[PDB]
Amino acid sequence: NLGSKLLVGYWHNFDNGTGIIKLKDVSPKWDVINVSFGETGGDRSTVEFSPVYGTDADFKSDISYLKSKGKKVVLSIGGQNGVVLLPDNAAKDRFINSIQSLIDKYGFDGIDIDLGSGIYLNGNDTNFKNPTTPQIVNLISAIRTISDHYGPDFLLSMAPETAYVQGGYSAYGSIWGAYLPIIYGVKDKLTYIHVQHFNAGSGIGMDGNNYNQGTADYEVAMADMLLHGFPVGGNANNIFPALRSDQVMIGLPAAPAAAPSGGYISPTEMKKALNYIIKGVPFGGKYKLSNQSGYPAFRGLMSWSINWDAKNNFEFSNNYRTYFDGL
Numbered sequence: 001n002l003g004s005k006l007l008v009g010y011w012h013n014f015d016n017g018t019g020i021i022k023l024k025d026v027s028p029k030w031d032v033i034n035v036s037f038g039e040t041g042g043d044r045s046t047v048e049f050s051p052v053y054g055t056d057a058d059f060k061s062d063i064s065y066l067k068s069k070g071k072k073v074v075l076s077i078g079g080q081n082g083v084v085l086l087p088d089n090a091a092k093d094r095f096i097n098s099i100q101s102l103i104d105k106y107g108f109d110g111i112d113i114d115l116g117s118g119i120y121l122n123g124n125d126t127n128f129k130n131p132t133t134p135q136i137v138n139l140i141s142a143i144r145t146i147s148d149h150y151g152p153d154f155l156l157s158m159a160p161e162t163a164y165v166q167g168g169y170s171a172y173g174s175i176w177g178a179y180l181p182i183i184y185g186v187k188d189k190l191t192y193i194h195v196q197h198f199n200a201g202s203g204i205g206m207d208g209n210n211y212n213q214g215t216a217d218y219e220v221a222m223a224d225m226l227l228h229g230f231p232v233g234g235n236a237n238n239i240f241p242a243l244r245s246d247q248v249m250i251g252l253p254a255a256p257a258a259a260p261s262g263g264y265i266s267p268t269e270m271k272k273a274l275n276y277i278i279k280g281v282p283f284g285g286k287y288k289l290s291n292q293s294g295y296p297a298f299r300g301l302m303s304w305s306i307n308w309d310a311k312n313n314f315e316f317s318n319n320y321r322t323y324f325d326g327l
């Protein structure tokens, strides 16, 4: 089903200046399309989705078309208008039910967790293997429930910001390390995670060194933490286990303007990072990969976004599709 080297692209269910691309006009170089976004209302628990073009039937059909071409179409939950809060079981239930309705209604292949707010580790919540914060406990439970409700082909991805994942290396509490219990809690269902390596400023690698976003060293350092695992919150006895390599992707801006706070990296520089991550071929960078000979099963790249890419002469899709095809 899913290839071993993927390009995952976010698809704007909205016009933000980059315009709208009809599903059928989406470049075939994308393996997975993350429809953005499923959003919530006042109750911040019931997820709603209405296609930005066409009737419900038309959209269902365009999705079926893409799926007929072997593409996966996933519903991304989050964005600025998709805040989800699950303070109790009642909220979790509305969330689960609303999500399942949408998947059934439009035939989505799975869901993408792209929540960038409302997610905190409460005081006393110190064990990523056993979270105690309701939001996090309930989110894990809801995700497991939804996953189990569908067949073997159900796709589950996540796109947390670095603070929620790699940030766990520096601290564990509040947002810092907050997705770790989520990842750990659903790792048996997780298809892949593509952390947002952008709008992130700088990040500390397992070597305790600070790296700037948008540089090859940074990409390697941040990905290596998931590929190898790392000690959490300065505790050598609290190791977050490595994910499967085929569960690890990197999320990148398709163009400089797709990440106004920085993070874009040129394909030429990104290919150096990829060659190192995947093949264990260094490029004279400062960061030293945990695995000398690389992680060949590294899963691929995610991008914000399909719409930005199209507006940028398809630089992202063309460059990386060719690169991965060349493997």
Ligand SMILES: O=C1N[C@@H](Cc2cnc[nH]2)C(=O)N2CCC[C@@H]12
Pocket (backbone or CB within 6 Å): 010, 016, 079, 080, 081, 114, 159, 196, 258, 259, 304
């Ligand atoms: O780069 C991004 N940009 C924002 C832009 C937006 C918000 N709501 C609608 N569009 C976003 O949603 N993201 C989610 C994935 C990356 C991150």
